[PDB]
Design an enzyme around this catalytic site. Structure first.
Site, short mmCIF file in Angstrom:
data_model
loop_
_atom_site.label_atom_id
_atom_site.label_comp_id
_atom_site.label_asym_id
_atom_site.label_seq_id
_atom_site.Cartn_x
_atom_site.Cartn_y
_atom_site.Cartn_z
N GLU A 112 0.88 -0.98 0.02
CA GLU A 112 -0.05 0.01 0.15
C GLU A 112 0.96 1.02 -0.06
O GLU A 112 1.89 1.22 0.69
CB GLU A 112 -1.04 -0.01 1.21
CG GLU A 112 -2.48 -0.37 0.71
CD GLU A 112 -3.03 0.76 0.40
OE1 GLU A 112 -4.11 0.71 -0.64
OE2 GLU A 112 -2.74 1.99 0.40
N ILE A 113 0.55 2.34 -0.71
CA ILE A 113 1.10 3.52 -0.65
C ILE A 113 0.81 4.41 0.57
O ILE A 113 1.81 5.26 0.90
CB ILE A 113 0.91 4.26 -1.98
CG1 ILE A 113 2.19 5.16 -2.38
CG2 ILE A 113 -0.45 4.99 -2.22
CD1 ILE A 113 2.63 5.22 -3.71
N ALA A 152 4.08 -0.11 -6.05
CA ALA A 152 4.08 -1.06 -6.79
C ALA A 152 4.34 -0.79 -8.49
O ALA A 152 4.83 -1.70 -9.18
CB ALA A 152 2.72 -2.01 -6.55
N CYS A 163 -7.84 -6.22 -6.11
CA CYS A 163 -8.96 -6.22 -5.65
C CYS A 163 -9.53 -4.94 -5.24
O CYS A 163 -9.23 -4.24 -4.29
CB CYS A 163 -9.19 -7.23 -4.73
SG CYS A 163 -8.11 -7.53 -3.56
N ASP A 212 -8.83 1.47 -6.90
CA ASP A 212 -9.26 2.79 -6.75
C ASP A 212 -9.64 3.20 -8.50
O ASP A 212 -8.57 3.34 -9.09
CB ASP A 212 -8.34 3.87 -6.21
CG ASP A 212 -8.92 4.07 -4.88
OD1 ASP A 212 -10.01 3.80 -4.42
OD2 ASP A 212 -7.85 4.46 -3.91
N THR A 261 -14.71 -8.22 2.35
CA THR A 261 -15.34 -7.02 2.78
C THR A 261 -15.24 -5.94 1.46
O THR A 261 -14.43 -5.41 1.33
CB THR A 261 -14.89 -6.25 4.11
OG1 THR A 261 -15.19 -7.27 5.02
CG2 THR A 261 -15.93 -5.21 4.45
#
EC number: 2.1.1.33
Lengths: 201, 374, 201, 376
Positions: free
Chosen positions: A61-62, A97, A116, A119, A185
């Protein structure tokens, strides 16, 4: 400021995955093999953990706040656990990434890559070539989104890139990863095999 | 009244044609030894904001010359009249969305590889008609800023494009099968600014790092590194204040001799290393050459190096715009050719006077030090 | 009478590939990774040998005269050679691929399988599942014949089997193995990727 | 005048229904202890050439009985009337191109797995209408002759089909994803004829080999082997003489339902051998007992914790006896013992169920061949 290795071989993985450090050798017994690109709050990872106990899984994650949240989250899972191995195979790092994948992963290192609910571009004709690099032949790219337009975007580029081929709906219905994806979720799914590279000898 | 310093030189294969960038212009000069310089035309770009011109390149047949115009994010193609009084005729302008940063001509001698500021790489057929609105997808791309491109070929005639970037990467891709990354060369801790390709898969790379890197690019192995820190230290000034920050600006190879030259941005020298004939990739210092001003560009023509200097702040008669360095077999050393250089300064002064564009206020001079910004 | 192992693990490969026996360990340094099914007189193998020097290549033939011919042939190539490794990575055995492939090869062991000019069935919807077994995910099946009917037969079963996907003409034009195939003593070609198995966890 | 020997027995779960194959016929008998046998019907196959009937199997609800008819390459489905005088009503015949050799019912209790002589495996929904011309592709296949099929399930409810063949293979495939071979069990040097599945992934296999093989089939590891050569040696005869020297084969291996016992028989010998399964170390076998009979054992079956045997009594004299034996475990004696009364009454029930029928009572040479596993 991002931290990333000078090369994949300089990467110390024994801090994220301490349970797979050989105490004798000081060596890693396992390598990261599954990647969750944009892992967000780490849900998919949590569900993948027990499904793939033999596999090291890394989320990227950024967003800084989100990664700190996830670090704490998995640390907890690890201690709130009976066994000596509960959630030991799962972790996150803050990283880009789109830029540094090849710093972390050797060529053909990964078996699976997940995107998944990306954005509304980590999927691009141009970026796909780099993903193809770190994803082994036969490896797969997993894709789920609730945005029809986003789904069709991802599909068009994956299908146009010579190194990717869509897997059939029949294939998806038999695949555990697809189930876990659909239950994390209005859900559009697409999966792709990393085709073998044509031999240029 | 100061003449705009020269940004780059490009010498035709025989040596009789020399091209120079000054501000938004290209000057051509014809040359015959010993030391005769004839003005052969001025082309100006007629499109804060600096209309840079960059990357002079001659096709293999030297029929055409290509370059990049920043004003226009374009690939300029010129026709080259070896006989005409004015040698250059602008005949095409291929425009792009982002400005070209580096280019390389393909083996076919008709396809140009353009690497842009944003990390995309395009190919262009220079024979084709410039499309008013640009409509073609990148051939490959990085998400970092692209620093250099080289088309390259293995023994079997297989083509590869090598691209380097601001995030320390050196990527090797198949060409034209650009969807296939061959490998990356790992080792640089800092941005890479310059690559040059040698014999038998030798590659040399440099930039923000403290060392020059040597690779076998087929192997992907880093053969060795040459630390040049204990050489440029004395040459560092308060333009290297960021606390000590310096960067190689260009690294280039002699054509037949086992020599490599490079310069660190905003220093007044070029450093020349020798390439080991005994053990491929091994480097050793050969010589340092010092100049009255900062080196602003470094080029090679066969076995000679040309240099261009920042002489913005001379006094009286503006001199030392460029230097031609030649190898002296007798002395086993590189030496400036003062006559040829001095006559060149003379030819520059008289080619350029009158032009209020090229001769101008000192603050109206394009920024000259642009690799530290990485 | 055929000779084949009780299990892949009981197979001694050090007699066919003596150059890859570690003298210290008494161990194999390499494993068979390419298979030529119905290798006939061994032509394709000869051409593959220098193109894949890192790879052990095995040919299988059921005809005994043909295998003895090929044994002698490669023995010669080996001695008629300057280097200490010339044609050392190539060999043949008499066996029945339709029956004993799993006796010789572990699951997912092979990267490539060649069926070149098969006799007008080693290709069957039923046999494909066993081939899928010994061929790794991402591995490929290479096919060339001069018989249009035979080519269409092979194509139909490969494409109908859930574990195989045809590679494109673009893929074939870039692939060295296809060139070597097309140039081994009116040629229809088809190639297939061994798709990843759907995860049944 | 000799009565055709019985080819097989199949006992319903409670024990009150017994089915027997004789030639091309199935006889049903109802049973109440101690030792009361009532004839409950005869079905005959009304289609060199031997019209074999094989592989009696009851669905889980015992509403239906299935079997294979060679005459027809068919899967017979019968309705089972637990009350009727005639218990069996043939209601379907599913025909195939090659003759079925082994079958297993799926977990669903409606899908039948048919393994044929040529190496193909089909599935059939017994509820469906028999298609006049058979039109469906194999679910999986071997290129050798198929020997046995078992549907089987791991802890997670995942189904596997296990198939064995004439070329020493034991293949484990996913079901219904039959395009995916899970693994093979490697060890047999000779054809495998029989497999039986035990507790906690224990599998037992046998056939032409000198040993019974024990596996963990999840692991795929061969846990151990039991050599029975020094047991049947004395029992070998000149039917074990092999063409242009000692050749023998296990014909069937079967498990007690609750007790830790396994029984098997070598073809054309007059015994069954009983091994005990180690409770200490899974897969470990040890001899428990050998039981000898007046004739060759022709079939071996199990009902809960009892074994039934069927014998080749073609050549008795006077009153034909000993068609079958019921062996029960005696907790007191810690040993298996024939139940002579129940067996003897059965012989009696057989004799009177079958007389009149010129088909079943016939010349000695008009008796179907009875020893068919050596042909592998």
């Amino acid at each position: 400021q991002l931290e990333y290795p000078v090369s994949p071989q300089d990467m110390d993985w024994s801090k994220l995955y301490p349970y797979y450090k050989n105490a004798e050798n000081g060596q890693m017994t396992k390598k990261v093999t599954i990647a969750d690109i944009g892992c967000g709050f780490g849900g998919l990872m949590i569900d993948l953990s027990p499904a793939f106990p033999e596999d090291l899984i890394l989320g990227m994650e950024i967003r800084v706040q989100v990664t700190n949240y996830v670090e704490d989250r998995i640390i907890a899972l690890r201690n709130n656990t009976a066994s000596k191995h509960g959630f030991q195979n799962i972790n996150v790092l803050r990283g880009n990434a789109m830029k540094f994948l090849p710093n972390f992963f050797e060529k053909g290192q990964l078996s699976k890559m997940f995107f998944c609910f990306p954005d509304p571009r980590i999927i691009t004709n141009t970026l796909l070539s780099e993903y193809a690099y770190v994803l082994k032949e036969g490896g797969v790219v997993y894709t789920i989104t609730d945005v029809k337009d986003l789904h069709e975007w991802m599909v068009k580029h994956l299908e146009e890139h010579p190194l990717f081929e869509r897997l059939s709906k029949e294939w998806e219905e038999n695949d555990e990863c697809v189930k876990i994806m659909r239950n994390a979720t209005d859900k559009f799914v697409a999966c792709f095999t990393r085709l073998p590279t044509p031999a240029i000898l | 009244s100061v003449i705009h310093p020269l940004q780059n030189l490009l010498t035709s294969r025989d040596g009789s044609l020399v091209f120079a960038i000054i501000k938004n212009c290209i000057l051509s000069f014809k040359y015959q030894s010993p030391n005769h310089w004839e003005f052969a035309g001025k082309w100006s770009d007629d499109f804060p904001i600096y209309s840079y011109i960059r990357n002079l390149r001659l096709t293999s047949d030297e029929s055409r010359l290509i370059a990049c115009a920043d004003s226009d994010k374009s690939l300029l193609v010129f026709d080259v009249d070896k006989t005409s009084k004015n040698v250059l005729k602008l005949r095409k302008r291929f425009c792009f969305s982002k400005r070209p940063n580096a280019i390389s001509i393909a083996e076919d001698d008709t396809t140009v590889i353009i690497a842009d500021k944003f990390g995309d790489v395009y190919s262009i057929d220079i024979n084709s008609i410039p499309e008013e609105k640009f409509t073609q997808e990148p051939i490959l791309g990085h998400v970092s800023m692209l620093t250099d491109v080289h088309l390259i070929k293995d023994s079997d005639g297989h083509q590869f494009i090598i691209t380097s970037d601001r995030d320390e990467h050196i990527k090797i891709s198949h060409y034209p099968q650009c969807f296939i990354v061959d490998k990356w060369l790992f080792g640089h801790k800092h941005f890479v600014s310059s690559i040059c390709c040698g014999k038998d898969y030798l590659l040399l790379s440099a930039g923000g790092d403290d060392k020059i890197f040597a690779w076998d690019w087929k192997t992907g192995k880093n053969l060795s590194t040459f630390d040049y820190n204990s050489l440029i230290k004395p040459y560092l000034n308060d333009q290297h204040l960021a606390i000590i920050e310096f960067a190689v600006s260009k690294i280039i190879k002699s054509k037949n001799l086992p020599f490599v030259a490079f310069f660190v941005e905003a220093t007044k020298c070029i450093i020349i290393l020798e390439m080991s004939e005994k053990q491929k990739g091994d480097l050793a210092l050969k010589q340092i050459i010092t100049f009255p001003y900062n080196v602003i560009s470094l080029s090679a023509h066969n076995d000679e190096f040309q240099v261009t200097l920042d002489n913005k702040e001379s006094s009286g008669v503006q001199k030392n715009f460029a230097k031609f360095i030649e190898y002296n077999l007798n002395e086993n050393s590189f030496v400036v050719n003062n006559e040829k250089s001095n006559e060149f300064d003379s030819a520059i002064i008289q080619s350029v006077q009158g032009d209020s564009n090229l001769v101008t206020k000192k603050e109206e001079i394009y920024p000259l030090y642009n690799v530290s910004s990485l």
